[PDB]
Amino acid sequence: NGPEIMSKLAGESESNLRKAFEEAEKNAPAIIFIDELDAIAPKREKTHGEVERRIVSQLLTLMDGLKQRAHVIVMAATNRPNSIDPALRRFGRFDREVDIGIPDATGRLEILQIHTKNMKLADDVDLEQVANETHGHVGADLAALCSEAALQAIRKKMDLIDLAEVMNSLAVTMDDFRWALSQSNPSALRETVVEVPQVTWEDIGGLEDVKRELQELVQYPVEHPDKFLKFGMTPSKGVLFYGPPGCGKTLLAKAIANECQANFISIKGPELLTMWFGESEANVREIFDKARQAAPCVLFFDELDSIAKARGGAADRVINQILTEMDGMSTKKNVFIIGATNRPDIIDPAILRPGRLDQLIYIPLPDEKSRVAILKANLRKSPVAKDVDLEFLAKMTNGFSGADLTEICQRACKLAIRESIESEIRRERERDPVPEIRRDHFEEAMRFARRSVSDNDIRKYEMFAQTLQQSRGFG
Amino acid sequence: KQKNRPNRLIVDEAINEDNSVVSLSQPKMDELQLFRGDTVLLKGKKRREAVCIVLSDDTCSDEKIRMNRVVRNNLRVRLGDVISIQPCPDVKYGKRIHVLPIDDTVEGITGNLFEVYLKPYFLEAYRPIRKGDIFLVHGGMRAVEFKVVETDPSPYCIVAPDTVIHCEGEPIKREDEEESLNEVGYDDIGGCRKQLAQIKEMVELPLRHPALFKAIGVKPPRGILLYGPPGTGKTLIARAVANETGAFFFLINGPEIMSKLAGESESNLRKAFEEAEKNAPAIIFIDELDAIAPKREKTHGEVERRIVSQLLTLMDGLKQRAHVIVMAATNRPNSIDPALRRFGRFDREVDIGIPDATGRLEILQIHTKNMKLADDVDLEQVANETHGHVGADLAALCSEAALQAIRKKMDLIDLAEVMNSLAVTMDDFRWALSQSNPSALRETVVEVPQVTWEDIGGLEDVKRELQELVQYPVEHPDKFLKFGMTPSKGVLFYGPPGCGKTLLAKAIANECQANFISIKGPELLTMWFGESEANVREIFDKARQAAPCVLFFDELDSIAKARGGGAADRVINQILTEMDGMSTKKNVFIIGATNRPDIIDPAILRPGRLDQLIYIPLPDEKSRVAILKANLRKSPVAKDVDLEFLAKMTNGFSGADLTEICQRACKLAIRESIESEIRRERERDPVPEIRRDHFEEAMRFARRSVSDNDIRKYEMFAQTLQQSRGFGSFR
Ligand SMILES: Nc1ncnc2c1ncn2[C@@H]1O[C@H](COP(=O)(O)OP(=O)(O)O)[C@@H](O)[C@H]1O
Ligand SMILES: Nc1ncnc2c1ncn2[C@@H]1O[C@H](COP(=O)(O)OP(=O)(O)O)[C@@H](O)[C@H]1O
Ligand SMILES: Nc1ncnc2c1ncn2[C@@H]1O[C@H](COP(=O)(O)OP(=O)(O)O)[C@@H](O)[C@H]1O
């Protein structure tokens, strides 16, 4: 370990660092691991002192001391790539760079069976929906969650005479898992997830032409590499998305990466504003290089007009590095940039030039088949029964926002929660839950939904569409 | 708690003069399985022991055990306390005994004390002794105390006639601090129970249960941070878990490590943890962890990086060996080096915080256990106005009150006259509160306020959705395991100048029995202008630690007026980034207050982040009665006017304006009482009953603080809030 070398006195830092390297002279098949090397070799100008430079210099000297003699392998534990100084991680000398990241729902699931294959669960928990949630959780925290579950298994037993009545048969419940999760905290929070999410593409209906160029864009650069090379031109680097602020949070680019089995990294809107306001224009290189290293991922940028709204009181700091690293990027690596912006008038003029971002795909307001698909997605992954209908909404929902329709469904579902509370009151003054909503349970929810889009914004969307509408010739 | 042992009895006075003879009742000796001359083990405080012989006593109570003050001083107990008596069938006779007399009991007498005191006391008596105990042997019309130093049967022994007694001349010093508990009382520390129970569980279940570690898989605690304000009793917390399980405490000061020279600074830690490692029950307390381990940019020096690295190595060297854990005090966890806060290495992190009102009440009770009161104080409203204080400040308060009680006495003959009984009164505590410098001030705290929903009425359907949006998700989550999806993360209040919104928000957390935090608007402006927007993340972290809790925000139009005349600020996007990482679970409810909802950054109105918007109108004419019923306290009157005369004609006035009317009537009433009593002093029972005229000049000497052109903007928001509803379905 690195702090073993750091803990010794001056002059003894040479000891217990080279000593493993002539110990590796004995063993021809051998590896060398240094734990927590960020404390060993940080930025040289960041350190105040000289012994740190001595340790860094002797480690760099003993890196190539075994120049393919014993064929040993050096691996290390780095918390961040920018913690390591760039002189040590130069190419040819300690430069093979892979990553770990955070596990997905299946990874958290496998962590759960690994940590529960030794202990005895009470074989009633699902252990899968638990791993589907706990977003931003290290598997060490999953081990701590299992330890807290066993602690609750001790705790629900009263103060006994210390005999194996509960010790021989450890009883754990799903409510125990949830309450141990409640008395816990994530440490992998506010980090960019590199795993692919799934919505399985059925939840979005309509916009079939938009689906046609979305299957044109990212489905076959690696699925049809030679067929795309029949003409020889490069794939389209960037696509810009514009339309009304409705049904426009996420999951479309996640779906279109999910047919390609590609990773997903989303860039948040206020994350860009925080990096702009905090004068931190160096971490954009880190997240862009992480996105390039997570290939074949497709990027997603949200609310670029918010930076333009901040400039409104066209180019600024965060636009400059985005343009620089987007132009300074190969046409390979299967990397696509998707920009979400509901205000196309205030955007940067160098974005819309072709070669960088060219496909100005317009997303219209959700129509009748789109809202039928939205109610079907609300039926998806949610408990529901029959007598529900959608033909009332043929003129009730003429044109609605998708977020408006989801909060309609959520408010009606919480009205069903309120009538379940009334069923609890029924059980209270007795001394049926009826989870399915009423036939006209949406009737008061009709007064809980305003069309937040104004008609002049639809007019300016039509004007920007007809500005980019092109010529028609015949005869 | 445990019914496995009937050992818990009551300490009572004894009849027999023998120090090695204790008394018990006849029916309770057969339950404890004791013989005629059985030797038992008595356990008192500071895990000390004393071995005596139980004899049957007819007048002894069944629930009580009789002992004299020699046994009582050895067990470090008093009258009315509880001890445990254990039968010991493995007691053997003594081989060698080394004792040393105490210095103050041998002054004036010289010579061989073996043949005068030690020989008739230990001949044909079979008295069992304990190493470290104090026994008194009379002789020569004086009282000479004796203390056991070294025995060849090192745990305990019975003084055989063949036992050689080593009694060479060396006078030992009597320590007055050894008698009082140091500090073994579970109830000695107070005001922390909601987390004291948690930390007592996480240090209790690793102890006493070594075989439970194979069932637990991995032990959850290895190193526990104790962060909070200074003076809250972290040393007393560390001494509280000390000696309650029979584990070695071994307090280690951070300055005591930093004070020594290099090499010696490298020493006294691995020596310290190996001295912990030789014993199986072992705790280590560290004070001033940040003095040992500050931030990396704070480290300008060779030695400190070496000692942080050595602490890191010496912590992760132990891996499930001999169940040893460590606790450390901390100002605030941002100052600690973040490489320490890992998993398997400082994973369990607990907060203490300031004491509550009942907490400061019981802490005042604890610190006034040992001193005599005059029995005239209220002693609860003393603790009620101690806002922004700490337990060290409370100790300073009681010390200054006793100092003022000393100042009641003049310069007397300096003998024991008022030392027999003190006469500290309530105005002494008022004077101590007058010269009271707080420590927890300039720091926002968390507590559960006392409102209980009955101060303000109205909003009868806003309150119902307020319980089923906040309270009932906490109450029953099985309906959320039903058809129910995720609930709303938080709401925002907009309406009048929000003088009622804080009392409208605090009442839920009292009803929910949840915590509350109010981050005020000037603090948010200080976070913007002071370039301290990173600390909002730690504020949200302490909010998540205080789950369940209510996040109160206010005057978000104030931060938007500085840019409206860009849109977002350095703190608005940071707040959005913090609340976007908030889970749908954990019941972390947020609430915002805004006087001007038009000047709002529009990155909050979409659902998913924050969906529900709560409009409130002015308190109407029936709401005047609801506000005036809350004036039963803080301006008490019984019957002088009906409290509906002002509400019958006045069109619109704020409840802030109505309480301004009440406080100005209070001012007029107190003033006319003052010219009622100065004339009686001039001529030579307050009668604080007020009349209608104070209400008359209060209701005429007033001004409606709200503006009418903002109200029509609120019905502009309300006519926006009539929406695109349908008339009805056709089934
Ligand atoms: N399914 C989708 N996934 C991602 N972005 C979309 C989708 N539909 C539309 N968008 C883009 O998002 C923008 C509007 O997003 P918006 O609806 O404001 O987000 P939210 O759903 O969080 O309110 C539009 O400019 C549009 O181009
Ligand atoms: N809440 C409390 N209850 C009782 N005593 C307290 C409390 N807080 C502080 N004290 C007293 O203050 C003294 C100092 O405690 P503490 O602040 O933990 O030590 P340090 O200043 O070394 O951290 C203790 O001896 C304790 O008796
Ligand atoms: N329902 C109410 N409406 C208006 N003001 C009230 C109400 N109830 C109490 N108040 C008064 O408001 C004061 C507290 O105002 P506060 O909530 O701190 O304002 P702000 O939140 O704007 O700082 C109290 O002194 C109380 O007299």
Residue numbers in the entry:
A (entry chain B): 270 to 432, 439 to 588, 596 to 713, 726 to 769
B (entry chain C): 18 to 432, 439 to 588, 595 to 713, 726 to 772
From the paper:
Human p97/VCP (valosin-containing protein) belongs to the type II AAA+ (ATPase Associated with various cellular Activities) protein family, which has two AAA+ ATPase domains. p97 comprises an N-terminal domain (NTD), two ATPase domains, D1 and D2, containing conserved Walker A and B motifs, and an unstructured C-terminal tail. Six p97 monomers form a functional complex, featuring a double-ring structure based on the association of D1 and D2.
However, in the presence of ADP, the NTDs of the mutant allow variable intermediate positions, which may affect the accessibility of the p47 cofactor. The presence of the nucleotides, such as ADP or ATPγS, destabilizes the dodecameric formation. When the nucleotide is present and binds to the enzyme mutant, the p97R155H dodecamer dissociates into two functional hexamers, allowing cofactor binding and performing ATP hydrolysis. Our functional and structural analyses showed that the p47 binding is likely to impact the p97R155H ATPase activities via changing the conformations of arginine fingers.
